[PDB]
């Protein structure tokens, strides 16, 4: 199948799937990828996570799977329909490119299934300190089905469960197919991070990856939705402001119970009793970017 | 166009969509078509009407659509995705044939959309007296999400709204591409009915459409799911038993309010105060079939 140069797309193409819990640097990540001349991710499709949830429910129900099987609507038919649907959306919702990419955060709960549908696809699982993601969703009011934004305790508990699943999926898929990317390390060290990422993806280095802010709205560049919640952050160069700002805004009882609330923090290397952890020191490149932002260049 | 004489499935494919409110003779209709060697419908896919409802849903919802459009997920992308999903399911869930067909009752709420997606598709809208359809779903407990089976009034109200939409959609699609098929006429006059239907479809006559019960479980024939609620009716030849079993079982208040609950009855030629309407005179063929059914063939 064909996108208008003549690019082919299909089942076996090397798709890139980016996700993680929302408020974890997923839009930044896909934006840096969009900045690459060979790659296009584009905006969150919304419809991909929706159809994945629908399909999951159909096989989850014993009776429903039985009815579908009796109808000739077997795993093999469903999987073929899913592949074709998902590819049309990924291929057609943005500009054509050699390498196609998708970012819808919670698709990474389905990375085992997606890797089966698309045997050459790879996954980037954004990992951010859950305290930072949770502070983000609460203060900006980014609504996520089932999360109670009036409660840090609830949001951290649900962050914890969500990343637990995505991280197990990532581990199941294996180090060849899924790479956890630490948001704080992306931000502090974007050159080295992107070097490792592009290498994992088998894609050649491009410097444009470090200049995504110059490629917003441009042909072959970074297409943004004006109504997605990360847009006003992503129009800036990689910068340091968002790393540790959550500190001191977590209710005292939740700080105390952090290790029980979010055991995934320790599992991922975030010390649950540090407020905050020392995430590290920034490359001069990011210090300079941050200074340009504060001067109001963007 | 992808693999399935080597037939190709693609959006310009000749396709038949059969539907109607459940309990309106849709399984009988599709089985009669299946009996034809050039056509395969097969079992209800269940999932096609769910993706259509998903598609149809947020076009009214201002916020979802605006978000999708800003993401580049426009009508054109969605339509391309829907076509691909639907073709995969229709093509791969049963045996190939020159003319593929799908029967999922509620797909006919989206015939205008389906006609646009599939420019060479045609539609058969099954119409049955709403009192017969409602009495069936209540007595057999055939569940429809949103229909309250503890109420004739509720079910009739929801039948009415459902068929109002499907009929309006059929009229908009137009005479060349959508044909209302009346269940009672189908049963009373199978030969005449199928002759008219097959003509509409541009498909030649075959006596096999009048002997669907002989082709059940056979190659090129009629594949039935044992879980589908109409299966034990459809194994029998076309017969007269189910035309007016509803008579006398409608609550009196509902009988009183019938034209107001179900104005679509009169609009479709069913007298809402005949209990039951004289649907017509049965062909000897169906009288004979009914007698064979009664003796217990």
């Amino acid at each position: 199948l064909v996108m208008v140069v003549e690019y082919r797309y299909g089942k076996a193409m090397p798709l890139i799937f980016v996700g993680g819990v929302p408020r974890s640097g997923t839009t930044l990540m896909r934006a840096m990828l969009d900045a690459h001349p060979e790659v296009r991710c584009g905006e969150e499709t919304r419809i991909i996570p929706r159809v994945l949830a629908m399909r999951q429910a159909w096989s989850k129900s014993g009776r429903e799977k039985l009815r579908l099987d009796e109808a000739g609507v077997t795993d093999e038919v469903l999987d073929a329909a899913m592949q074709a649907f998902i590819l049309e959306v990924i291929a057609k919702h943005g500009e054509p490119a050699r390498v196609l990419c998708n970012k819808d955060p919670f698709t990474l709960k389905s990375s085992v299934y997606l890797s089966r549908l698309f045997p050459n696809s790879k996954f980037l699982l954004m990992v951010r300190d859950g305290r930072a993601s949770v502070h983000s969703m609460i203060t900006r009011k980014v609504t996520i089905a089932g999360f109670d934004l009036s409660s840090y305790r609830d949001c951290l508990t649900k962050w914890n469960k969500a990343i637990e699943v995505m991280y197990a999926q990532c581990m199941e898929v294996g180090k060849e197919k899924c790479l956890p990317v630490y948001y704080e390390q992306l931000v502090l060290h974007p050159r080295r991070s992107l070097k490792l990422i592009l290498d994992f993806l088998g894609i050649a280095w491009s410097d444009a990856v470090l200049h995504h802010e110059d490629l917003i709205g441009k042909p072959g560049g970074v297409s943004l939705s004006k109504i997605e919640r990360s847009t006003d952050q992503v129009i800036k160069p990689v910068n340091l402001e968002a790393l540790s700002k959550w500190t001191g805004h977590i209710p005292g009882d939740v700080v105390r119970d952090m290790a029980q609330i979010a055991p995934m923090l320790a599992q991922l290397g975030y010390d649950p009793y540090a407020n905050p952890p020392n995430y590290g020191n920034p490359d001069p490149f990011v210090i300079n970017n941050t200074q340009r932002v504060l001067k109001g260049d963007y | 166009e992808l693999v399935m004489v080597e037939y190709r499935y693609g959006k310009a494919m000749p396709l038949i969509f059969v539907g109607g409110v459940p309990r309106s003779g849709t399984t009988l209709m599709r089985a009669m078509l299946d009996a034809h060697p050039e056509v395969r419908c097969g079992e209800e896919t269940r999932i096609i009407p769910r993706v259509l409802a998903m598609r149809q849903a947020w076009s009214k919802s201002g916020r979802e659509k605006l978000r999708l459009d800003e993401a580049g997920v426009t009508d054109e992308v969605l339509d391309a995705a829907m076509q691909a999903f639907i073709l995969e399911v229709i093509a791969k869930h049963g045996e190939p044939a020159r003319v593929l067909c799908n029967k999922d009752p509620f797909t006919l709420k989206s015939s205008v959309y389906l006609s646009r997606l599939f420019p060479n598709s045609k539609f058969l809208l099954m119409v049955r007296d709403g009192r017969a359809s409602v009495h069936s779903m209540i007595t057999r407990k055939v569940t429809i999400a949103g229909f309250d089976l503890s109420s004739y009034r509720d079910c009739l109200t929801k039948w009415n709204k459902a068929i109002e939409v499907m009929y309006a959609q059929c009229m908009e699609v137009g005479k060349e591409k959508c044909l209302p098929v009346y269940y009672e006429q189908l049963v009373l006059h199978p030969r005449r009915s199928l002759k008219l239907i097959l003509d509409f479809l541009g498909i030649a006559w075959s006596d096999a459409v009048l002997h669907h019960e002989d082709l059940i479980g056979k190659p090129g024939g009629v594949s039935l799911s044992k879980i589908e609620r109409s299966t034990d009716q459809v194994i029998k030849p076309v017969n007269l038993e189910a035309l007016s079993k509803w008579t006398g079982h409608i609550p009196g208040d509902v009988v009183r309010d019938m034209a107001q609950i179900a104005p679509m009855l009169a609009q479709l030629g069913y007298d809402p105060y005949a209990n039951p309407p004289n649907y017509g005179n049965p062909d000897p063929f169906v009288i004979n079939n009914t007698q064979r059914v009664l003796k217990g063939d």
């Binding site: - | 459940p22 009407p49 429809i144 999400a145 949103g146």
Partner: peptide, 9 residues
């Protein structure tokens, strides 16, 4: 049941 015999909107 998780799913009814039929549904749409």
């Amino acid at each position: 049941e998780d799913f009814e015999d039929y549904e749409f909107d």
